Design a protein around this ligand. Structure first.
Ligand SMILES: [Zn+2]
Ligand SMILES: [Zn+2]
Ligand SMILES: [Zn+2]
Ligand SMILES: [Zn+2]
Lengths: 49, 49, 616, 24, 383
């Protein structure tokens, strides 16, 4: 299954959901890359909540 | 089972929208009326080898 | 005549110039023309008050033809019979004919209406414990029944069970027509059934219209309802069984139709399998309940051959059980010699004749009024095609020019060998090959019909395609069937006369007709009903395809004109094709060389004591 | 079954990351 | 207690149940003209700056208007631009669409009909999509109407067929800004009465709720356009009573093509500016040398007629003695049009004018009142 992400959708996720941007700030530039981060989030329960 | 994501940087959306429209015209051509149904075959030459 | 002088141009009408009928001033709102010569009704669909006119005429008349603009209807005896059975009196009908027609209704038309409509419902046929009684409300009709006295020992007399059709035709040729109307509401001798439609089942408006034609006044009326294949005539049978709620027997042409109909009862209506039963060769066990249901084949009942004791006991049970309803599926085979007797051997109150092809080469299709009853409902093929109920087929006629050597040998040949020659011309080979090649690239499932075994085998070995003729094994006819259904590598099946009748086949959107069984007007619509069930119907821009590949300057046009006469009576248009775009640039060529064509020509020409037991 | 679910998920993520790096 | 089939036949033939036909239509004509009997010269916005806001959304894909909403609105907007430039030439027009959540200005504000028609036919090709936002469109209109002078009226038209707006900020602040900037708003919705559009039309147009209009059928939409071409009457408290400096250029005639001051292209014709002797292509346009509103007499001529609205022609009573057998402006014989001998004389087709006492027929009335703007009876009077 494939989901298509646009940059505007990423910005809407950041503005509408500060928890995702909060994880993005201390997760992406430090440990793992952005597509890995988004796949982890999409496989996580926080996305479901 | 598996999760695959696709991230666009707001610069490649034209590619898959072009893919969508060429798929649409491809299925339109595949569901199109054939040329001998929409046109009269009387005046043209007879069928052969 | 209404004091109208004949004109110099009126001499070319054989007493059919109806200009003496005076034009009404408010004729613009009147959509009808009434011919006093034969009762033919001319209906315009574009005029105002069009839907009132069309449903009024389908209540009172048989549609001769229904094209787009002007519709043709026939005022007959049986349409008036059905109208007055469902509750339409004479003077009301005459008044609305006068109101809805431009020309005034002539005296001959009113005389015909009053003569046909009156004296109806006088004689009535009832069944009392598997014994036929004709009942008359007036006593002197018994005395008028003095010529064909077949009496066997309120105003009633018993009839012999095998002479009931003779009594019906005798009553039809006299002005007192026979009536049968099962009042299941007032019937208490036969136990009712708990059969009812499942709440998940949806019914279409034309099926409801057909049932309202059948179940009009308040009684179950015996008659014929014809619907397209895929329109759900089986659903109409299920719903009629659920409406009558009496014991129902179903006669089918094939055992596969028997099991399919049993599946339809088990799926669409709330009928338990203990209330459903099968009479076949393998299956003869029946319901033990006081009233149930059985599905069987026509030659269960009408076979005169030496049968099993089990089948003997079964048909004794069927004769000894009084039935309230029979569903005679594919009623066009009922006027056959054995199959006529099944309505007399099986005493059933209501007889519904369900079919899709109400046409025969002989004239016995007209006798189904005596066998079943008046014609109830005609389904408009174009109306169901445009609203997405049956498929939009493109009927076509591919003209194959007859080759020189083949025609030269063809002009001195005998008739059976004439068919054997003109079926195997190479131009039809090339046309069929190109059509298969093109429509296979369209993602179209193709069923190619050819009745001759040699023809289908030759084409299938020429193109490397599967073929199913009569003596193929049944497991092969299932494996190849599922490969045509699901394996997209196989999209072409060459099929015999076996495919014309009821055998289960996958859905196809293109059909090719190589050979044919003369001008047999039933076969073409049976073939077309296979394509009419196409699943791509709801897609916009979809067009199913039908091809009748004919050989030019040979008997094919005679036969095919007889074949398409029925279809153009139904309204389908066969666009003629004399040229295919692709012969000049086809990749693979079948019989392109003169030597290969000549080889095919000669091929068709050459076609036609306990110890001494070990001793022997 | 559990370890294959975990490894297929993490290597699908890593392959998506590698594809995204290769495209950029 | 039975099934639907086992009841009765529909009896559709008996369903149809069956000189004073003149009055049945002409009293409807009196009722239609009853709403139009009130007329007085309203001071209206003569120098106009209209912003046509276009919905370009998934709601424009709805199959209620033929063939979609999008094509009919874009072609009716082409028609609207053409007729409005034919009736209000001195105005300056900007076209904007609302597509994909951002207000896309498709053409700058200008006095050229052809460029706006080109923009409309360019947008005609594209597919309407996205969630429309009003507040973006009103903020863009606020931006583009900022260089509009005080004499020129700031006007905005919206065709908002959607029912919900998803705005980035508070739309009420934008409404207050538009009211503070004296920008009058008329909204032409297509589906229902959206409350924010109702409040916008009420607040921006000084408490008037009659500027939010919803169509009923195909023809009423063109009715909305062709009474939307009219100049809106200004309120009494509006004081923009200024003098506007503009000149009258003369049509230069030369067999040598010369560079026009607007386009730097070779045009044989031109209009030399009276202030600075600069040629332009089209009129009415501003002079792009000294910022002078170059005009013709025809452009103000097109706008005189709003300032002199003709009083409605009053149809004479049938009982009173008719002045003449024929009409005044076309001398068609007035039809006797007697219903019957007992039906007597009704609907006398003579339309009197109150300033001149001259009778006119129905065709003369419906010609003099919108195509002409003078009464020939008022002119034959030797005053
Ligand atoms: Zn220029
Ligand atoms: Zn200047
Ligand atoms: Zn006039
Ligand atoms: Zn006047």
């Amino acid at each position: 299954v494939n989901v298509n992400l646009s940059r505007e959708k990423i910005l809407n996720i950041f503005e509408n959901y500060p928890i995702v941007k909060k994880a993005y700030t201390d997760n992406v530039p430090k440990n793992f890359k952005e597509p890995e981060f988004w796949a982890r989030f999409f496989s996580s329960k926080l996305f479901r909540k | 089972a598996t999760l695959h994501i696709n991230i666009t940087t707001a610069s490649d959306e034209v590619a898959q929208r072009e893919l969508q429209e060429r798929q649409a015209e491809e299925k339109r051509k595949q569901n199109a009326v054939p040329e001998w149904h929409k046109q009269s075959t009387i005046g043209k030459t007879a069928l052969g080898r | 005549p209404a004091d109208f002088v004949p004109d110099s141009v009126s001499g070319m009408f054989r007493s059919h110039d109806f200009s003496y009928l005076r034009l009404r001033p408010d004729h613009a709102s009147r959509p009808l023309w009434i011919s006093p010569s034969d009762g033919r009704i001319i209906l315009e669909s574009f005029s105002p008050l069009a839907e009132q006119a069309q449903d009024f005429l389908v209540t009172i008349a048989e549609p001769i033809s229904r094209p787009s603009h002007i519709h043709e209807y026939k005022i007959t005896a049986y349409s008036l019979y059905a109208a007055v059975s469902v509750g339409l009196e004479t003077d009301d009908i005459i008044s609305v004919l006068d109101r809805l027609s431009k020309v005034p209704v002539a005296e001959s038309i009113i005389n015909f209406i009053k003569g046909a409509t009156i004296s109806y419902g006088k004689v009535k046929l009832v069944i009392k414990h598997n014994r036929y009684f004709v009942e008359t409300t007036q006593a002197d009709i018994l005395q008028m029944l003095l010529n064909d006295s077949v009496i066997g020992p309120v105003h009633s007399f018993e009839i012999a069970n095998e002479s009931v059709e003779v009594v019906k035709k005798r009553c039809q040729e006299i002005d007192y027509p026979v009536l049968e109307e099962y009042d299941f509401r007032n019937d208490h001798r036969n136990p009712d059934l708990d059969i009812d439609l499942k709440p998940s089942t949806q019914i279409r408006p034309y099926q409801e219209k057909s049932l309202s034609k059948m179940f009009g006044n308040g009684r179950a009326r015996s008659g014929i309802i014809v619907l397209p294949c895929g329109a759900g005539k089986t659903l109409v049978g299920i719903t009629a069984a659920c409406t009558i709620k009496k014991s129902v027997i179903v006669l089918c042409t094939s055992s596969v139709s028997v099991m399919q109909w049993r599946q339809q009862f088990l799926q669409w209506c709330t009928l338990q399998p203990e209330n459903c039963a099968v009479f076949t060769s393998d299956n003869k066990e029946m319901f033990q309940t006081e009233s149930g249901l059985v599905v069987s084949t026509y030659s269960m009942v009408a076979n005169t051959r030496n049968r099993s004791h089990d089948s003997q006991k079964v048909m004794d049970f069927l004769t000894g059980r009084e039935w309230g309803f029979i569903i005679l599926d594919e009623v066009h085979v009922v006027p056959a010699a054995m199959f006529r007797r099944v309505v007399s051997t099986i005493a059933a109150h209501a007889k519904l004749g369900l079919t899709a092809t109400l046409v025969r080469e002989d004239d016995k299709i007209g006798d189904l009024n005596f066998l079943i009853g008046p014609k109830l409902y005609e389904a408009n093929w174009m109306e169901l095609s445009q609203k997405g109920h049956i498929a939009n087929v493109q009927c076509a006629e591919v003209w194959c020019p007859m080759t020189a050597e083949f025609y030269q040998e063809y002009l001195r040949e005998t008739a059976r060998k004439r068919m054997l020659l003109y079926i195997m011309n190479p131009t039809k080979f090339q046309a069929c090959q190109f059509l298969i090649q093109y429509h296979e690239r369209r993602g179209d499932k193709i069923i190619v019909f050819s009745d001759n075994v040699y023809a289908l085998q030759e084409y299938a070995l020429k193109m490397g395609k599967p073929f199913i003729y009569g003596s193929t094994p049944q497991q092969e006819r299932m494996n190849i069937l599922q490969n045509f259904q699901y394996n997209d590598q196989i999209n072409t099946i060459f099929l015999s006369k076996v495919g014309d009748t009821s055998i289960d086949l996958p859905e196809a959107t293109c059909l090719i007709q190589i050979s044919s069984h003369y001008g047999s007007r039933r076969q073409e619509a049976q073939r077309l009903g296979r394509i009419l069930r196409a699943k791509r119907r709801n897609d916009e821009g979809f067009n199913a395809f039908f091809y009748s590949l004919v050989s030019k300057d040979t008997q094919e046009m005679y036969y095919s004109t007889k074949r398409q006469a029925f279809l153009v009576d139904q309204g389908y248009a066969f666009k003629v094709i004399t040229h295919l775009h692709g012969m000049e640039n086809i990749p693979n060529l079948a019989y392109a060389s003169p030597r290969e064509r000549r080889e095919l020509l000669q091929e068709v020409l050459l076609k036609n004591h306990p110890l001494i037991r070990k001793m022997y | 079954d559990n370890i294959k679910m975990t490894l297929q998920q993490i290597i699908s993520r890593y392959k998506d990351a590698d594809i995204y790096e290769e495209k950029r | 207690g039975g099934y639907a089939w086992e009841d009765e036949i529909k009896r559709s033939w008996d369903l149809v149940k069956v000189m004073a036909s003149l009055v049945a239509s002409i009293v409807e004509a009196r009722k239609k003209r009853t709403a139009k009997k009130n007329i007085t010269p309203y001071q209206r916005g003569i120098i106009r700056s209209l912003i046509l806001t276009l919905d370009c959304s998934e709601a424009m894909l709805e199959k209620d208007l033929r063939p979609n909403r999008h094509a009919m609105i874009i072609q009716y907007a082409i028609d609207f631009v053409h007729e409005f430039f034919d009736q209000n030439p001195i105005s300056q027009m900007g076209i904007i669409i609302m597509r994909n959540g951002l207000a896309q200005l498709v053409s700058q504000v200008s006095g050229n009909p052809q460029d706006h028609i080109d923009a409309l036919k360019s947008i005609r090709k594209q597919e309407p999509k996205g969630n429309p936002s009003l507040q973006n469109a009103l903020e863009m209109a606020r931006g583009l109407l900022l260089p509009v002078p005080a004499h020129c009226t700031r006007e905005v038209l919206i065709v908002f067929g959607s029912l919900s707006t998803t705005d980035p900020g508070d739309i009420h602040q934008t409404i207050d800004s538009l009211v503070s900037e004296k920008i009058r708003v008329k909204v032409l919705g297509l589906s229902a009465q959206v409350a924010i559009c109702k409040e916008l039309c009420k607040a921006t147009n000084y408490g008037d709720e009659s500027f939010y209009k919803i169509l009923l059928d195909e023809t009423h939409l063109k009715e909305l356009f062709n009474e939307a071409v009219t100049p809106l009457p200004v309120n009494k408290i509006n004081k923009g009573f200024t003098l506007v400096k503009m000149g009258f250029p003369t049509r230069i005639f030369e067999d040598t093509p010369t560079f026009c001051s607007c386009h730097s292209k070779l045009v044989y014709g031109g209009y030399f500016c009276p202030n600075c002797h600069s040629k332009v292509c089209s009129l009415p346009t501003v002079c792009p040398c000294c910022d002078l509103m170059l005009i013709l007499s025809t452009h103000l001529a097109r706008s005189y007629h709003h300032l002199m609205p003709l009083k409605t022609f009053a149809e004479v009573p049938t009982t009173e003695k008719f002045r003449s057998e024929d009409c005044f402006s076309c001398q068609s014989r007035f039809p006797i049009l007697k219903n019957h001998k007992n039906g007597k004389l009704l609907t006398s087709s003579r339309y009197r004018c109150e300033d001149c006492k001259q009778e006119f027929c129905v065709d003369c009335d419906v010609f003099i009142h919108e195509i002409l703007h003078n009464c020939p009876g008022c002119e034959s009077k030797p005053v």
